[PDB]
């Protein structure tokens, strides 16, 4: 298979607007949401149909209890950060954990925290230490690193358990996650040439323009890979035409091991 990843996010908000949850937690496999929990529902629920069909009620009930606990821990930690920053108002706390299983069989694992959307603490599971970005994080780093067993626990989870979960979910959702839908690609001019692709899955795609068989990335406008809403994606890239000299332009698209070239007459 190609590269896949599993990650869980947590969001905490210290003084949210009424109705807006103080805590949200969402899991993803690749770009697909799989799980959700918040402080309003107080329930962990599936966000993909192949998760609901393959995980028994005891799974959702157990993690519902753990997430109620994790919700409280997040509030306490955010309260401590905002006090040590001496910040008034509403501020945010975020966590991301997960792992990648790469095409060549190697793995990665990551765990990090953010305050107000900026990196705060970043775990290094090889040196078993926390990288702090400022003195508030430095205070937390000291406390967390004093609990050596917890660092070892996180290394084991990232390297063994997380990859096991990922393989389990990849099999559950194999009909969605392991399929290939090739792009439909077309060129037009609006002067500049636009190369547009749509209808493809997975979302990873590379589009570029070549001039007389040469690539110059600083002359190309790259569009974002965007969801179309039906499970497929679309993207584009553009380049401006030199009206003073003749040149052969070509759009090149690489997707899921297939290369396409569209030569402009």
């Amino acid at each position, epitope marked *: 298979m190609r590269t896949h990843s599993l990650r869980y996010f947590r969001l905490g908000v210290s003084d949210p607007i009424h109705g807006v949850p103080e805590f949200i937690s969402v899991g993803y496999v690749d770009s697909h949401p799989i799980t959700t929990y918040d402080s309003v529902t107080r329930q962990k629920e599936p966000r993909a149909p192949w998760m609901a069909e393959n995980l028994a009620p005891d799974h959702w009930e*157990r993690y519902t209890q753990l997430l109620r*606990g994790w919700q409280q*821990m997040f509030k306490v930690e955010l309260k401590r950060l905002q006090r040590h920053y001496n910040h008034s108002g509403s501020h945010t706390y975020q966590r991301m954990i997960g792992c990648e299983l790469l095409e060549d069989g190697s793995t990665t694992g990551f765990l990090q925290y953010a305050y107000d959307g900026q990196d705060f603490l970043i775990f290094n599971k090889d040196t078993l230490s926390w990288l702090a970005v400022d003195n508030v994080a430095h205070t937390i780093k000291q406390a967390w690193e004093a609990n050596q067993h917890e660092l070892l*626990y996180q290394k*084991n989870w990232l390297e063994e358990e997380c990859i096991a979960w990922l393989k389990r979910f990849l099999e559950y959702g194999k009909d969605t996650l392991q399929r290939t839908e090739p792009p439909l690609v077309r060129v037009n001019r609006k002067t500049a040439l636009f190369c547009k692709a749509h209808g493809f899955y997975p979302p990873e795609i590379y589009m570029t323009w070549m001039k007389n068989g040469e690539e110059i990335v600083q002359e190309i406008d790259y569009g974002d890979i965007l969801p179309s809403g039906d499970g497929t994606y679309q993207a584009w890239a553009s380049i401006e035409l030199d009206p003073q000299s003749s040149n052969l332009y070509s759009c090149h698209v690489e997707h899921s091991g297939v290369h396409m070239v569209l030569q402009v007459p």
Partner: antibody
Amino acid sequence: GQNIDQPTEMTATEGAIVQINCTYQTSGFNGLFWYQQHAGEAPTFLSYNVLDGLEEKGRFSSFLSRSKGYSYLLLKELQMKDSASYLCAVKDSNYQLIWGAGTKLIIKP
Amino acid sequence: NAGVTQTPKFQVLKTGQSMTLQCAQDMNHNSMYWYRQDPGMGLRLIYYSASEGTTDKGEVPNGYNVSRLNKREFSLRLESAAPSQTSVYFCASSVWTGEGSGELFFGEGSRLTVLE
């Protein structure tokens, strides 16, 4: 099914060394604990292992092999006060503890 | 600075009698647990409370109920005692949820004998 096995009873001599074994088959692994429980008293925490290897804490050491699903608790220079039950417990993939039935350690003076 | 305080240490009951076991912890712990211990088997979880304001069943919840009254207290109720509930009951707590390397802290135990 998830299972954890340890011998029911062991007898050793004062001053000697004893190794208490614990084997486990679980759905996932998030660490192995040893607890001491004197007769008629509460269990108390002794040790935690989650990566492979040996960890020492006084006269007690704890070893873990994740690939073999095996741990031992090593007691050196046995004293009469080491007479107790020793409980092994493993956290599974959903962080639920599975408890062994305990090993009663009897020490001959 | 008392740790985990549970009561009573001993209790005899007649079949059908009600009983509440009390447990409090003063360590500012978030998760609390009720276990039973019986000869020849490992500890079995009855009910647990991952955090203040939530509880859920363990492995052997039938015949029991719990109340997480506040952050400190987690009581165990036997509404109609049965001879099979003769056992030694342990309350325990940990700093946070069962997720992580954190150990359990146990109360002294409550020995119950239920007689016809």
